[PDB]
Every structure is written in C-alpha cells, then in structure tokens.
DNA sequence: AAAGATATCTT
DNA sequence: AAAGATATCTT
C-alpha cells in the first residue's frame, strides 16, 4: 500500500542517514542547535523527498501549502479521485532519556475541524485520511564544538544535537487524546504514552467520528468545561444523557 | 566595540554566504522549503557562529537558553561583570518586493518586562542592552520548491527559496512600535517602516524608559485599551491625566 | 487593526 | 492540568 511503502521508506531512510548542518553554496557548513524548533524544521525538510518519491510510485500528486497558516504539510491525491485526499502532517517532540512517555500537539481544534475551509489547503471534507508522521529524538547537550563553521571534508566531525531518532506513521484520530495540547493556541493533545503505543495505535477514541465530535464540542477553558466535559469518561456520560 | 565588530561581521558573512540546503554526514543535500518557519530557523543557525566568534574576541561568555521558550537567543557577559549582560534576539520577516514596509514581532509584553524572571534566562534587571538582529528576505515568485536530493557536486544547481537578504542590528526599544505584534501570543510590534529606518533607528519612543512603561501598561484587548490608550498619542495623554 | 491561526514547550 | 511562553503570519 502507499501507507506500508511510506513507513518502510521513512524507517529505512531514518537509520541510514544523519543530518548534521545547513550548507551554503560556497561550501561552508553550519552546525545544528538542540531545540525542537530546529529539529522540527530538519525532519520536515528530510521527509519531503521521501514522501514525493513514494507518492509518485503510486501515481499520487503531492502538494504543499501555498500560504503559511495552512494545514496539512502534504496533500496527496490521484488526478482521477480529487475527493479522496490524504493529508500528511509531520510532528516532532523530544525525550531526555529513551523510552520515556511522549506527547504531541495535533493541530488546532477551532479551525478546519469546526469550519470546513479554515486554515486548510482544501476543504476538510475532501480528505479521507489524516496521517501523522511523528519524530522523537533524544536531546543532546550543545558543546563548544557546535559553535564554529566547518568544511565539506569535515562532515564526520560535526557534532549532532540529537541522539536516537525514532519515527512512526499513524492516523491522527487513533493517537488523539482527551486533553488540550496547548492553551492559548488551542491545540489538540495526543495520548501521553510510550513510542510503541503510537506505533501500535493504542489510543482512547473508538472511532474517528467520536474523535471529531469530542473535539468539536470541547470548550476552550476548564471553567467552560466544568459543566460539560473535561475528559473521555465525562464526554461519554454526557452523550448518554442527551448532550446536556 | 563588541557592537560595531558584531555589525561588521554580520554584513560580511551575510554578503558572502547563501544557505541552500541541509546536509547529512553521508554527503546528501536536501533543499530548503519555502515557508517562513524554515528561513527563521536557518538565519538563527547562520548567526550563532558569528556571534560566538566576535564574543570570544572580546572576553564575553555566550549562553543559550536551557528551556526552549526562554528569552533571549544569546546572553553575552564577562565573568567579571555579571550584572552587565547583553541580550540578543534574532528576528526575521519577508518582503514580496525589495522596497515595501516591513515589521517584526519583538517578544512578549506580559512576561519578563512585567515579571522580572518569567521566561528569561537571567533576571531582566541583569541585562543592560537588548539587541535585535533582524533579517529581511525577499521571497521567490515560484510557490513550488524542489522535492529531490542533491550531492556536493550540484551545489550550484540547488534552487534557493529567497532572492535577497538584508540584516541589521539595533536596540529593541529604538525600533519598538505602539501596536501589538500578535494577539493571542501578546507580542510587542515594531515600527512598520522601510529597512533604512530600522538601520538608522528612526523609532517612535523618546526613551527606553518610555518604551518600557508603554508596554508594561498596555492592555490585551482593544475593549480594555479604549479606556486607557491604543497608541503613543493616547499614552502620552494618559500620562498627563495622571495614569488613569 | 485586531484577533486568532500556524508548531511545540514549560511548570 | 491548564494556562501562557517561544516566532511570525493572515485576514
Ligand atoms: Mg534560539
Ligand atoms: Mg528569540
């Protein structure tokens, strides 16, 4: 499948390669920093050619947002079936010691899931799947060595700010949790679990429909959630009683 | 001085080098994406080496934040002058055409400038200068970036997502404006002017003390600002009224 | 303008 | 946890 091939390519590529810096056309190389803003950018750039390569093999068109505040990172679709689009979003997070619990922010809950055309490349209803390619890296302490420039002949000497990158591909709804992933930027939070749980998809929602409904009626502040629902249990009781 | 040296170094380096992709230890080069998040990250990484080079040359220790959401990008100081720290923050924005007005987001106005230690590496009072290194780049007309990899031989054939870059170093207060830079993330907005004005430092505040007082008393919503002040004029009128 | 999107972190 | 930081954009 497009899915199996994509995950095989990512898993494979992720083990045989290591990004160590940005290069100038003049051949000068600049080291990488240890914070997620940097690694997030790197993993996205890294994944681009792989996604494109695998998509092409299955006859899929790949499109990136034309504007900045638009989801998803990649929109795939065959010319003959425009209303069956696949959204692929790359998400990153870090861990301090391998095998700790991790969590991701899964996108806003007040944009395209509530308004079919808000901050999204194509109307939400034209997508049949929302895939998350999650990267987890163990953070490494920045040393003095990563504060100078390098030359092409020194590629092997440049220190990396990450240690053990792990990658997975999973449907957004499957890994979605019941607590917000951010306050003022109102993001959906993922389950807070170990990497294997994301790969295996041991989430809390029974269906994508339950996921959507939960997040479409989630109130922005605990104050507003006090009389409604603050988690999946309370949401199910709320549903049972008639949504009141 | 440290400041003049840093400014000279920034002009040269930037005038001599153009970043075109990220590179793996194995020599494989991945091209840059077009979205602002990418360039914001690249310019920050492009500057680290320069800042560290000039800092060492002047007896200054350079420190980056441990927590990822702490200001500033770089804290410079002599071990002998602990309470004479300099803060440097890197900001970027784009222009579609080389001579349009630009503006930057300059950091929050509700964190450390109101609460001396919130989200800052060292207490605000230990800093005696706050510089902003701003990069302005002109986007390219094409909305479609390259989706294949390149090798060291092809450096000259990799398309760049930007057409031209300008940089400047200036004190934060000198270029601060009176309108917020962001809403839910409560950022200070800078003046909305031409590149030349940021270089020359043609701001709106009469002093850093005014800049600080203005932003320490600015309200989050226009509803609350309407009974206080919404711009420099109204703020000055608010001072006359007795700050009520 | 002003408010709220885009991604992720911290306590 | 929930709320509010980190950059910067868009409408
Ligand atoms: Mg930084
Ligand atoms: Mg900064």
How far is the C-alpha of A74 from the C-alpha of A120, rounded, in Å?
A: 11
Instruction: Give the CATH number of the domain where residue A129 resides.
Output: 3.40.600.10
Rg (alpha carbons) of chain A, rounded to whole number: 20
**B42, B24, B7: which is closest to B162 by C-alpha?**
B42
The technique by which this structure was obtained is: X-ray
Rounded (5°) CA angle A118-B135-B67: 75
Distance from residue B90's CA to the centre of ligand 2 (Å)? 6
B141 touches chain A (CB under 8 A): no
Q: Kindly report the length of chain B.
A: 244
Q: How many CA atoms lie within 13 A of A63 on its CB side?
A: 18
Helix locations, B57-177, DSSP H: 172-175
How many other CB atoms are there within 10 angstroms of residue A184's CB atom?
A: 10
Cβ of A223 < 7 Å from strand D? yes
| A73 labelled binding-site residue | yes
Q: Residue A38: which of B31, B41, B52 has the nearest Cβ?
A: B41
Is residue B170 within 8 Å of B161, Cβ to Cβ? no
Helix (H) or strand (E) holding A132: strand A127-138
The protein residue nearest nucleotide C5, judged by CA to C1', is A69
The angle, 0 to 180 degrees and rounded to 10, between the axes of the packed helices A36-57 and B36-56 is: 140
Whole-angstrom distance, CA of residue B105 vs CA of residue B75:
19
Report d(CA B222, CA A8) in Å as an integer: 52
CA distance A218 to A197: 24
Q: Which long-range contacts (CB under 8 A, 24 or more apart) does B35-40 make?
A: B35/A65, B35/A68, B36/A68, B36/B92, B36/B94, B37/A41, B37/A68, B38/A41, B38/A44, B38/A45, B38/B161, B39/B92, B39/B94, B39/B135, B39/B137, B39/B161, B39/B162, B40/B92
Catalytic residue among B91, B166, B172, B178: B91
B residues 213-232 closer than 8 Å to A (CB): none
How many separate domains does chain B show? 1
Residue entry with tokens 């700790």: A100
Rounded to the nearest angstrom, the minimum Cα separation between B38 and chain A is 6
- Ligand 2 centroid from CA A194, angstroms: 31
Q: Is B91 a catalytic residue?
A: yes
Strand D close to A66 by CB, under 7 A = no
Q: Could you tell me which of A120, A107, A135, A157 has the C-alpha nearest to residue A46?
A: A135
For B52-153, list the strands marked E by DSSP.
61-63, 74-77, 85-95, 105-108, 127-139, 150-151
Could you tell me if A123 and A87 are in contact, meaning their C-beta atoms sit under 8 angstroms apart? no
Fill in the DSSP letter of residue B71.
Answer: B
Domain of residue A129 covers: 1-244
- Considering only residues 47-106 of chain B, list those whose CB is below 7 Å from strand C: 66-69
Rounded CA separation A42/A90 (Å) = 11
**Contact between B20 and A23 using a beta-carbon 8 Å cutoff:** yes
Decide if B19 and A18 are in contact by the 8 Å CB cutoff: no
In angstroms, the CA B59 to CA B2 distance is 10
Question: What are the residues whose beta carbons fall under 8 Å from the beta carbon of A215, sequence distance 6 or more?
Answer: A109, A113, A176, A188
Chain B residues lying within 8 Å of A23, measured CB to CB: 19-23, 29, 155
Non-local (6+) Cβ contacts of A229 within 8 A are A217, A218, A235, A237, A238
Nearest to B22 among A33, A36, A45 (CB): A45
C1' of C7 to CA of A187 (Å): 10
A57 touches chain B (CB under 8 A): no
The burial class, CB within 10 Å (0-12 / 13-18 / 19+), for B94 is: middle
Render B200-243 in DSSP notation, one character per residue: HT--S-S-HHHHHHHHHS--SSHHHHTTS-SSHHHHHHHHHTT-
- Give the number of C-alpha atoms closer than 13 A to the C-alpha of residue B6, restricted to the C-beta side: 22
Residue with tokens 């020599």: B27
B171 assigned to active site:
no
Q: Which of helix, strand or coil describes residue A122? A: coil
A130 CB neighbours strand C below 7 A? no
Is residue A34 within 8 Å of A46, Cβ to Cβ? no
Is A151 at the interface with chain B, CB within 8 A? no
Residue list, annotated binding site of B for Mg(2+): 44, 73, 89
């Amino acid at each position: 499948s497009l899915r199996s091939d994509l995950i095989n390519a990512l898993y494979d590529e992720n083990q045989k390669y290591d990004v160590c810096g940005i290069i100038s056309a003049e051949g000068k190389i600049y080291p990488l920093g240890s914070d997620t803003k940097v690694l997030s950018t790197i993993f996205e750039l890294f994944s681009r050619p792989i996604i494109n390569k695998i998509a092409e093999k299955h006859g899929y068109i790949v499109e990136e947002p034309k504007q900045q505040n638009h989801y998803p990172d990649f929109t795939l679709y065959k010319p003959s079936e425009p209303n069956k689009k696949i959204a692929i979003d790359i998400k990153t997070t870090y861990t301090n010691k391998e095998n700790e619990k991790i969590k991701f922010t899964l996108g806003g809950y007040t944009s395209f899931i509530r308004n079919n055309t808000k901050n999204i490349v194509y109307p939400f209803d034209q997508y049949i799947a929302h895939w998350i390619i999650g990267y987890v890296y163990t953070r490494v302490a920045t040393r003095k060595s990563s504060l100078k420039t390098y030359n092409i002949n020194e590629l092997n000497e440049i220190p990396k700010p990450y240690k053990g990158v792990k990658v997975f591909l999973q449907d957004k709804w499957v890994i979605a949790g019941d607590l917000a992933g951010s306050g003022n930027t109102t993001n959906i939070g993922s389950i807070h679990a170990h990497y294997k749980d994301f790969v295996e998809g041991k989430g809390i929602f029974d269906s994508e429909d339950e996921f959507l409904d939960y997040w479409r009626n989630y109130e922005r502040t605990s104050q507003l959630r006090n009389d409604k629902y603050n988690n999946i249990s309370e949401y199910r009781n709320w549903i049972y009683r008639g949504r009141k």
